[PDB]
Symmetry: none
Subunit: 77 residues, 5 copies
Amino acid sequence: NFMLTQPHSVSESPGKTLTISCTGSSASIASHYVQWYSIDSSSNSASLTISGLKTEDEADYYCQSYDGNNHWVFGGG
Amino acid sequence: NFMLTQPHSVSESPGKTLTISCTGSSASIASHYVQWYSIDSSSNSASLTISGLKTEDEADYYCQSYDGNNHWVFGGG
Amino acid sequence: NFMLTQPHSVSESPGKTLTISCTGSSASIASHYVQWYSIDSSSNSASLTISGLKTEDEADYYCQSYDGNNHWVFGGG
Amino acid sequence: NFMLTQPHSVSESPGKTLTISCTGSSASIASHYVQWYSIDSSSNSASLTISGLKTEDEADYYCQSYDGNNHWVFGGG
Amino acid sequence: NFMLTQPHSVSESPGKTLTISCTGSSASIASHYVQWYSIDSSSNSASLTISGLKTEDEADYYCQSYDGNNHWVFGGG
């Protein structure tokens, strides 16, 4: 999980900016993800019966970003 | 999971900007994802009966972004 | 978990900026992630019955970022 | 877990800036992560019954960032 | 766990700045992480019954950051 908020921001950035690669994979059960723009805020998850769960996952991430002056240069992933 | 909010923002960015590659794969059950623009906010997930779940996933991510001055340069993914 | 907030910010950054690679993988059950822009704030998760969970995960992360003047340079991942 | 807040900030940084690689993987049950922009703030998680959980995870992180003038230089991950 | 706050800050830093690699992996149950921007602040986690949990995790972190003038230089991870 990576979570970023900038509720306010002043940026002067003549730049390479927000570059995001390979953000990994999420498996979720009954999970709530919430961002909405007497006051009551409620998210209710309950009375859940779970039986035996077996998970076997093989994940290989190969992420390559190049800014390169390269002679005979070999990159192996 | 990658989550970004900029509820307000001032940016001066003569730039490469928001570049997103290979954001991984999500498997979800009964999950709620919410973003809506006496007050009651309710999302209710309940009384769920789950029997044995077996998951075997093989995921390989090969993501290549090039800005390159390259001679005889070989990239293997 | 990586969490960043800048509720206010003044930045002068003619730069390479926020560069994010391979942020890892999250498995969550009934978890709540919340960021919303008498007052009561409530998120309720309860009465959950969990039976034996077996998890065997193999994750290899190979993340390569290059700014390089390289001759006969070999990178192995 | 890495958590950063800059509720206010003045930065002059013509620089390489916030560069984030391989932030590791989190497995969470019923966990709440909260950042929202008589007053009562409440997050309630209760009455959870957990039976024996066996977790065997193999995680190898290979993260390579190069600023290099390199001849016959070999990097092994 | 690494936690940083700069509720105010004046920095002049034409520099390499906050560079974060391999921040390790956290397994948490019912844990709350909170940063929100008569007044009562309450986060309540209670009445949790946990039976024997066995965890066997093998984690190897190989993190390489180079600023190098290198001849025949070999790095092994």
